[PDB]
Design a protein around this ligand. Structure first.
Ligand SMILES: Cc1cc2nc3c(=O)[nH]c(=O)nc-3n(C[C@H](O)[C@H](O)[C@H](O)COP(=O)(O)OP(=O)(O)OC[C@H]3O[C@@H](n4cnc5c(N)ncnc54)[C@H](O)[C@@H]3O)c2cc1C
Ligand SMILES: Cc1cc2nc3c(=O)[nH]c(=O)nc-3n(C[C@H](O)[C@H](O)[C@H](O)COP(=O)(O)O)c2cc1C
Ligand code: SF4
Ligand code: SF4
Ligand code: F3S
Lengths: 236, 1468, 117, 117
């Protein structure tokens, strides 16, 4: 299942600038299914994997790589989203040229890095369409009060983890739309807001409490937020 | 070293037998080790009959009237330094003899001459005396001997009751006498002058010359024993002792009587293996059987499923296999009862045996053939002993018995076929009964309780289900040892598999499966002295591994005889719950076995959230040891159902502990769960289970063969393992005899580990197993030795020359938490620091490191050349490896580049060995085993071997090459000494070096190799790398090099032999701290190896075997080789950095060179962790210091060791006209069997002068008269001719390269040419080119590993042309058994006369047919014509005469891979 | 020999641990063999020390009596295997013994441990 | 240099055929009369008369890799460097001394700052 001997690296697609110059959607297309089965077959399962050690979350890349190379996308999706939250957006925004795809042993030998981010995007795409995703709601709710400040990625991930534990989470933010700067800071040109809306609705479905359009500086303060919960998280 | 025997066929005693025995012992001085003192020896012995006339004359001179019936003589060794102990021994023996009403005549002091014994052996000399006993009761002589034997036993017991040391009864009997001692071989007749009277006469005489292994002697342990004279070793000495201790409780026979109670512990304490063999042999013989019967019942013949053997012999083999466990091992036995005299071999037939029959009714057998002087006009037949065969002489009727007729006479006695059919085998019983399932959540919970991964589980198990072979690793181990591993680990990781290195060579399970058997018996244990039909009434299973169905069949067959025992302990129990559970199960098992039930089955199915599972290893060990100590194991079979075992090592360690059958069920349910989702494709579950069982069988066979044991019944319960990190009391109470050199965790730690794992498994709600990080690195856990950051740091530091970066590297490496033993040692001193300038120069340190060998087949030629260039540039010694070397590299380049290799290897393959390849060196190295694959030898994949590799190794392109595990020319330490003699003969200026692997019990091996005139020892660690090897062999084989190094240094300076060797090590030497600590422990040189590879470009991808290394180090394809990045300067920078780091450490310590620190072990201390909860590992036995005395701790001598000169000197003086003018020379000489390596130094001289193909064939011609010694014409280059009249000993033509050797019986010989053995075993080992026209039969393993040579012989032994690769072989006559095993190249022509070839030949990878094309017929005719022209063989001429009808008589054999590569198809 | 040393170590360890006392470890006594004659160096055995702690929290008299019983049991057990030259000089918590075959004038230069303050 | 001159002559070996590294402070007259094929590299500083009579060889001076100094603002060699050299190279890093490269003819020298004359 090495593959990289005779095959060649090929990106999903790229729309030419003749018509790309005017739209605001993404310039990359979904990965073809047979292209997915071929490109996944490109890694060599390098012992002591450098691909993982540089990915700041250090998810299990070669495992789902092998899986996608052979199939069983449900098992691969499960083992992918186990240790990484928000994979759909992380695999799309993070600069893999220096984080994960910038140190694969295939690239270091000048052969051409295996497209890791594209396979991450693909495996997170088809998994959601057929609906192999359920909100991680807890059982036997512990019972306490916890709150976060700022709906950014850090706050959202913290809230997801705490709701999976079984606390009562409260999200505060200044903006009217939730999701940190993914809906206001990052341009839609590089990331469609549809997937962020989908993920944030999934998060809300788990039992997360929202408090949109709030400020800790004027409307409230630190003693108030501290007394209102057990502990307060600051992701401003 | 060697045995021998002489017997009179008719049976009339005479002086000639004893005289010939003395003469034979006078000419075995060249096999045994040579001492420079000229006095000391290993111990010799002779065994003859009692000369009644001499003793009658003696007692008559004393005054008594000589009685008319037979007398009896008893030889005793009493203490000498004291006086009171002598009186005690004398009164003991006198009262014990006079307790039986016998009559005692008197004592006798033996005159000796003690001036010839050395001063080391004279210190422990016992007072030797004899006692004379008559017979006043007039009883028969059989009862006389039996009473004498009982008296001897009771005397031994009584004197053991008083702790009177150094007392030994040699032989108390009325028929035989034994003269043995610790002198030399020749000087025997000058120490015992009693053998110089013309009155001594005997019809049989046995003699032995042993080969000691330690400089310290011991008189009571010299051959021959009271009933035996054995040569060789014993692989199964623990299992047999344990099983005999089990059998002791039910041995009763009316032949003994009440005194039977005195003979309970038959196997005494503190005796050698052969001693135990002798004592059990005598105990069985005194019961009533005949000597051939017990010999066949102790060392049986290898039962094969063929049709060459009749059915009576088959029934006999089945009976003897069902009676008693075998005793495997290389053994050449020459045993004698009072009536029979038998001589035979073991199952495998390793050690040779050759005999001669004279017209005077005299048979002479021995290890060599030219020992005694016999005229050619007196012999009738010369024969040899094959596998398991035996030759006997009956003295009463005065008859001779060869193999077939003796076996028939033995089968004549009892109706075996009326008893063997009383057995039962579970194939139809399970098949007929078979034709008459768990939740994934609970499965995951149980797997998490036992801690099985997900990635690795389906990585090592998947090839077993899909393909049926265990997975193949790619690089060395670096995971920490078990005791320091943070995460949970099973019990099986704490056990390392043993393996024999030199003292007994392994057996190749891939090519010799015929002597391999996995049969097991249930309900066969009974009285060992009784014979009846009831014995062979049992259940027989073809494989000890059982699935669920077979287990249900066996259990519901046993019915009510079974008794289950729960193997779980309460989780809520206190700190001592585990010990209480152990005691509970022991008591339950004892009571159950007492309660009539005769079968015990361990089970842990009740595992759940309330009770935890007892480890299976500990449970079965406790149960088996308790049953042995309670004398109840002989009534009950033991079965275990484990829920953890997945790989072959677990089953191996579960069987070795003492189990019989196991059914690891959880593997089966996991496999079924995998198959139900459709992952294995279209394979039905039946095929999956079949492949799983087959893979487990093959793996277990491999682990057994790794130490030379071919029978499962003797390996069971032997305890052949090693514990590294268990408490001493634990393994000494609840485990069989196994040594743990360092103490480890006791009971509390194990209970804590199992409890924490159980809690993290059940008490939570898990979903999926962890990713697992055992075999490959993952971010979860399981810390390794080489991670990403450290690799990048080393590479950047070596490519940028920034020594500060290398210091940062070293700090990063040393900062990691403990992972090896060498991370638990601190170093301190007492003197003041010394500035770094005073430390010796860097170059004097860099010239010490070496680069271990790496086969050219493993890694691409670019890396090999780069390493060679760099190392030869800095001045050190690089290494070549097993794959040979290209000749075009034997000269320096134009740019001052030296691409040659300075150290050459002589491995077990002998692939590229050549007379020219052995002179382009400075030091030769001998390979025994390495740290990754200590038993199975190096292997090379199929798609790796290119055309260049085929040219280097003289082989066929694109074929799987696997090297034979055992050195076919090293079957004993004497073979090692002979091989070192050979190597030092062929190269007049190089050094020799052995290569061992660190394991327990290496001290005796160290002393032996030091006595074998070696130069440099090499202790290789257990974490070395490799090109390819099985995974289990990588993970669980070997021991840390600190243990081996400390043991070797201690045992080698204790014997005052340190000033003649140079110790060198490698394995996991990453930074300078490790090098300094190793130098302190006793090292003198250092090998880096794998680290250097990473400096060259490797990034530890662990895909060496897949031919797809992305960097381009280990690949043979052309494209990937372009991706190389190495440079000869990076290795230079790495070695410079290492040297500077060692310099800094030494300067900070307070010394000025490594010479002042080697052996100064007192500098070290052991620190430990406080809250680690680990029971402290006592490292003191490794830090113990023994004082060498006057000799320095590192003392050495310049130049290689000396060696006596052979005939070759006398040859190279007379041949001076050739070396000075190139004129033809023809010589003749008389060669005795003592002269070794005939015609080798001349080969070296003529290679250095002219070359290999420099002379025309037949330039120098030599003729020899008599019998040539072993290894005749080793490495005979083209241009030399050697014609010897007589016979050769063995190894003739070893490594032949272009020469021409011819043997023949002399013209005065009245024998038939094609019915008499003329050459010995393993002829033409690794031959490359030349011709060999022989006239006579050949020994065992004929033309093994032959590649290129042209050989014509008349007959052969078993396993002929084993692993053949090239050349032509023409056998005229009967072939042995299992002919053409694993043949891959060349072609063979066998002379058929009885159409019996298909019964014998092996059709694995070869095809046989009739001769078809006239071209090959003409070539065969040319070969036969040349053979006739050379030796004038009459039978060859008679074959030639009838060509028209003899053309269609032969059979042609060709490999299955040379068919389509042929230039002219053999088939029309 | 060396294997006999391992048997002796495991004997004394499995007999001390049968009562409950926790072993701290061994210690090799640093000696200086050079001041030994010839007839004595031929039969000089290895000298080692073992350290045991009283973690049971028992009075001194039961400790001494238990160590005496341990010594007798160890002697009997090792006699059971007929091992030669194994001698426990003194095992207690009140006194220690330094004895040998050297002269009387070189004692302090044979066992340097006796020169510490 | 004398040995290789007797063996291969003045220009018998290609440049860099044998290289030597020196740590610390070299003494006087470093590389006196070194023929082509020799290469010397000293880490530290040379005393005086360095490279005298150079004919074809190669000398290299340089502060060690841990130097906190400034290269072109310190002295690294002595006086009368390359007195009457014929051929070869001399690469340094630092200020030379007085009488730098007097009577030079054919050599190639590269220095960062020098002294009078
Ligand atoms: C391809 C790429 C492009 C990128 N482009 C950009 C870019 O254009 N701009 C950029 O900044 N980063 C950019 N980044 C970086 C990255 O997007 C941000 O660093 C990251 O999203 C910040 O996460 P956060 O945890 O700070 O969340 P944030 O979204 O920063 O969390 C802040 C949230 O808290 C709210 N808040 C702020 N103050 C208060 C307060 N006092 N009380 C209550 N709520 C408050 C804010 O309204 C907001 O909703 C880019 C990264 C990549 C890989
Ligand atoms: C890639 C590779 C190939 C090797 N090939 C051989 C070989 O052919 N023969 C041999 O005896 N040892 C071979 N070895 C083992 C080395 O000779 C040496 O024993 C070992 O590398 C030392 O341990 P280390 O891993 O710490 O360097 C090989 C090792 C490696 C890594
Ligand atoms: S990027 Fe390279 S090291 Fe990482 S998984 Fe893929 S092939 Fe293996
Ligand atoms: S692109 Fe994917 S693999 Fe790379 S760092 Fe981001 S999440 Fe990890
Ligand atoms: S891991 Fe193996 S494939 Fe080459 S790069 Fe290293 S030797």
């Amino acid at each position: 299942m090495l593959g990289f001997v005779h095959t060649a690296q090929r990106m999903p697609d790229k729309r030419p600038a003749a018509e790309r110059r005017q739209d605001f959607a993404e310039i990359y297309a979904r990965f073809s299914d047979e292209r997915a089965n071929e490109q996944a077959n490109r890694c060599s399962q390098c012992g002591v994997p450098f691909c993982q050690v540089h990915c700041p979350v250090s998810n299990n890349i070669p495992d789902w790589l092998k899986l996608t190379s052979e199939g069983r996308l449900e098992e691969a999706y499960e083992v992918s989203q186990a240790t990484n939250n928000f994979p759909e957006i992380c695999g799309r925004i993070c600069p893999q040229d220096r984080l994960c795809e910038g140190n694969c042993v295939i690239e270091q030998s000048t052969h051409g890095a295996v497209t890791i981010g594209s396979v991450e995007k693909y495996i997170n795409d088809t998994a959601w369409d057929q609906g192999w995703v359920k909100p991680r709601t807890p059982s036997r709710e512990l019972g306490l009060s916890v709150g976060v400040i700022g709906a950014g990625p850090a706050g959202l991930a913290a809230a997801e983890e705490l709701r999976a534990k079984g606390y009562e989470v409260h999200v505060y933010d200044r903006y009217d739309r939730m999701g940190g700067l993914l809906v206001y800071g990052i341009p839609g040109f590089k990331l469609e807001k549809s997937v962020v809306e989908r993920r944030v609705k999934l998060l809300a479905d788990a039992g997360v409490i929202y408090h949109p359009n709030f400020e800790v500086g004027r409307d409230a303060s630190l003693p108030e937020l501290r007394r209102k919960h057990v502990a307060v998280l600051v992701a401003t | 070293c060697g045995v021998g025997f002489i017997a009179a066929i008719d049976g009339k005693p005479r002086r000639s037998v004893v005289e010939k025995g003395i003469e034979a012992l006078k000419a075995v001085w060249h096999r045994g080790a040579v001492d420079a003192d000229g006095k000391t020896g290993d111990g010799a012995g002779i065994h003859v009959a009692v000369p009644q006339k001499f003793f009658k004359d003696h007692v008559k001179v004393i005054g008594h009237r000589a009685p008319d019936n037979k007398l009896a003589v008893g030889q005793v060794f009493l203490p000498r330094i004291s006086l009171d102990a002598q009186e005690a021994c004398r009164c003991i023996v006198e009262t014990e003899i006079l307790a039986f009403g016998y009559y005692i005549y008197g004592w006798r002091q033996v005159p000796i001459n003690v001036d010839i014994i050395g001063e080391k052996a004279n210190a422990t000399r016992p007072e030797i005396e004899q006692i004379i006993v008559g017979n006043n009761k007039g009883v028969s002589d059989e009862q006389f001997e039996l009473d004498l034997y009982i008296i001897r036993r009771r005397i031994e017991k009584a004197v053991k009751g008083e702790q009177i040391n150094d007392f030994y009864i040699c032989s108390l009997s009325a028929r035989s006498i034994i003269y043995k001692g610790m002198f030399l071989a020749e000087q025997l007749t000058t120490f015992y002058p009693d053998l110089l009277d013309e009155r001594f006469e005997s019809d049989f005489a046995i003699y032995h010359q042993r080969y000691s292994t330690n400089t310290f002697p011991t008189w009571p342990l010299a051959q021959p024993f009271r009933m035996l004279a054995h040569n060789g070793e014993i692989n199964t000495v623990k299992g047999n002792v344990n099983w005999m201790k089990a059998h002791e409780t039910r041995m009763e026979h009316p032949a003994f009587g009440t005194h039977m109670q005195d003979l309970k512990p038959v196997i005494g304490v503190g005796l050698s293996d052969s001693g135990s063999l002798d004592t059990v042999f005598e105990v069985m013989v005194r019961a009533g059987r005949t000597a051939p019967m017990v010999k066949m019942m102790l060392v049986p013949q290898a039962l094969t499923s063929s049709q060459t053997t009749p059915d009576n012999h088959k029934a006999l083999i089945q009976y003897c296999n069902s009676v008693m466990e075998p005793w495997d091992g290389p053994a050449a036995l020459a045993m004698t009862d009072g009536r029979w005299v038998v001589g035979g071999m073991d199952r495998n037939g390793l050690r040779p045996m050759r005999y001669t029959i004279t017209t005077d009714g005299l048979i002479i057998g021995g290890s060599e053939t030219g020992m005694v002087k016999i005229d050619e006009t007196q012999v009738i037949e010369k024969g040899r002993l094959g596998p398991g065969e035996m030759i006997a002489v009956d003295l009463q009727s005065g008859k001779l018995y060869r193999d077939r007729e003796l076996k028939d006479h033995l089968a004549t006695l009892k109706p075996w076929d009326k008893w063997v059919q009383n057995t039962t085998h579970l194939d139809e019983l399970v098949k007929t009964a078979s034709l008459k399932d768990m939740d994934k959540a609970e499965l995951r919970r149980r797997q998490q309780a036992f801690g099985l991964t997900m990635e690795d589980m389906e990585l090592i198990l998947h090839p077993m289900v899909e393909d049926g072979k265990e997975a193949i690793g790619s690089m060395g181990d670096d995971s920490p040892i078990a005791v320091l591993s943070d995460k949970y680990r099973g019990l099986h990781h704490f056990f390392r598999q043993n393996f024999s290195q030199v003292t007994n060579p392994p057996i190749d399970s891939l090519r010799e499966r015929r002597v391999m058997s996995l049969k097991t018996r249930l309900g066969n244990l009974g009285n060992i002295l009784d014979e009846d039909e009831t014995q062979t009434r049992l259940l027989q299973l073809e494989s000890p591994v059982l699935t669920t169905a077979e287990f249900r069949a066996m259990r519901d067959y046993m019915g009510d005889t079974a008794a289950e025992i729960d193997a779980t302990f309460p989780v809520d129990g206190g700190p001592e719950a585990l010990r209480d559970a152990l005691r509970r199960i022991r008591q339950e098992t004892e009571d159950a076995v007492r309660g009539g039930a005769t079968h015990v089955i361990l089970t842990d199915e009740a595992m759940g959230p309330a009770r935890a599972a007892i480890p299976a290893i500990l449970a079965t060990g406790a149960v088996h040891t308790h049953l042995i100590r309670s004398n109840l194991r002989t009534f009950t079979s033991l079965n275990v159902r484990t829920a953890e075992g997945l790989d072959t090592h677990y089953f191996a360690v579960l069987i070795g502990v003492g189990a019989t059958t196991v059914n690891a069920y959880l593997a089966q349910e996991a496999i079924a769960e995998r198959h139900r989702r459709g992952l294995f494709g279209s394979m039905p579950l039946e095929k999956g289970m079949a492949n799983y069982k087959k893979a487990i069988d093959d793996g277990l066979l491999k682990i057994m063969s790794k130490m030379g044991i071919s029978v499962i019944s003797s390996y069971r319960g032997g305890g052949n393992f090693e514990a590294i990190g268990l408490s001493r009391a634990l393994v000494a109470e609840h485990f069989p005899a196994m040594v743990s050199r360092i103490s480890g965790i006791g009971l509390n730690g194990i209970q804590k580990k199992v409890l924490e794992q159980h809690a993290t498994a059940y008490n939570e709600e898990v979903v999926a197993l962890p990713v697992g990080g055992f075999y490959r690195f993952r971010k979860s856990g399981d810390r390794h030795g080489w991670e990403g950051g450290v690799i990048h740091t080393l590479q950047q530091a070596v490519t940028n020359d920034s020594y500060t970066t290398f210091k940062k590297y070293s700090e990063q490496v040393n900062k990691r938490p403990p992972m090896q033993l060498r991370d638990l040692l601190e170093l301190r001193s007492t003197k003041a620091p010394v500035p770094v300038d005073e430390v010796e120069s860097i170059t004097a340190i860099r010239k010490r490191f070496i680069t271990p060998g790496m086969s050219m087949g493993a890694l691409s030629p670019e890396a090999h050349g780069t390493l060679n260039v760099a190392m030869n540039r800095i001045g050190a010694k690089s290494d070549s490896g097993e794959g040979g070397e290209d000749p075009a590299r034997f000269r320096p380049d134009k740019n001052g580049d030296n691409w040659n290799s300075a150290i050459k290897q002589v491995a077990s393959g002998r692939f590229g060995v050549t007379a020219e390849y052995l002179n382009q060196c400075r030091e030769l190295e001998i390979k025994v085993a390495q740290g990754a694959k200590p038993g199975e030898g190096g292997q090379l994949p199929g798609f790796k071997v290119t055309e260049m590799i085929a040219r280097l190794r003289h082989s066929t392109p694109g074929v799987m090459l696997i090297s034979p595990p055992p050195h076919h020319d090293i079957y004993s330490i004497e073979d090692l000494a002979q091989l070192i003699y050979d190597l030092k003969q062929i190269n007049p200026d190089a050094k020799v070096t052995v290569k061992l692997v660190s394991r327990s019990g290496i001290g005796t091996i160290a002393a032996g190799v030091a006595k074998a005139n070696a130069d440099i020892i090499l202790i290789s660690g257990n974490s070395g790398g490799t090109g390819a090897s099985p995974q289990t062999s990588i993970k669980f084989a070997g021991l840390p090099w600190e243990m081996g190094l400390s043991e070797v240094h201690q045992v080698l300076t204790l014997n005052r032999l340190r000033h003649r060797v140079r110790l060198r090590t490698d394995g996991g030497l990453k930074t300078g701290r490790d090098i300094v600590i190793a130098a302190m422990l006793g090292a003198e040189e250092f090998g880096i190896g794998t680290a250097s590879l990473i400096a060259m470009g490797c990034i530890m991808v662990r895909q060496c075997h897949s031919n797809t290394c992305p960097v381009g180090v280990c690949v043979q394809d052309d494209k990937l080789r372009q991706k190389f990045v190495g440079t000869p300067e990076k290795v230079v920078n790495l070695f410079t950095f290492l040297a500077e780091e060692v310099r800094e450490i030494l300067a900070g310590l307070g010394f000025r060179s490594l010479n002042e620190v080697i052996g100064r072990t007192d500098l070290l201390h052991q620190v430990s962790r406080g809250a680690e909860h680990l029971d402290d590992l006592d490292l003191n036995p490794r830090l113990a210091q023994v004082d060498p005395g006057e000799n320095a701790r590192y003392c050495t001598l310049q130049g290689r060791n000396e060696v006596p000169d052979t005939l070759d000197a006398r040859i190279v003086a007379d041949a001076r006209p050739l070396f000075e003018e190139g004129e033809k020379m023809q010589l003749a000489y008389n060669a005795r069997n003592t002269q070794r390596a005939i015609g080798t130094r001349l080969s070296s001289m003529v290679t250095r002068k002219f070359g290999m193909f420099g002379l025309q064939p037949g330039h120098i011609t030599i003729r020899l008269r008599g019998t040539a010694g072993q290894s005749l014409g080793a490495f005979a280059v083209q241009g030399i001719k050697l014609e010897v009249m007589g016979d050769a000993n063995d190894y003739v033509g070893k490594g032949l390269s272009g020469g021409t050797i011819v043997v023949r019986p002399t013209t005065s010989s009245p024998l038939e040419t094609n019915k008499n053995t003329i050459i010995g075993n393993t002829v033409l080992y690794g031959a490359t080119a030349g011709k060999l026209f022989a006239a006579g039969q050949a020994g065992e393993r004929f033309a093994v590993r032959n590649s290129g040579a042209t050989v014509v012989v008349e007959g052969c032994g078993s396993n002929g042309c084993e692993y053949m690769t090239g050349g032509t072989a023409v056998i005229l006559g009967r072939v042995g058994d299992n002919f053409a095993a694993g043949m891959t190249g060349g072609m063979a022509y066998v002379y058929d006369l009885d159409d019996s070839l298909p019964l014998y030949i092996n059709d694995e990878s070869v095809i046989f047919q009739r001769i078809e094309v006239g071209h090959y017929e003409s070539q065969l005719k040319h070969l036969i014509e040349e053979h006739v022209t050379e030796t004038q063989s009459r039978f060859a001429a008679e074959i030639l005469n009838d060509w028209a009808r003899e053309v269609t008589k032969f059979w042609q054999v060709v490999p299955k891979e040379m068919l389509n590569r042929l230039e002219v198809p053999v088939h029309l």
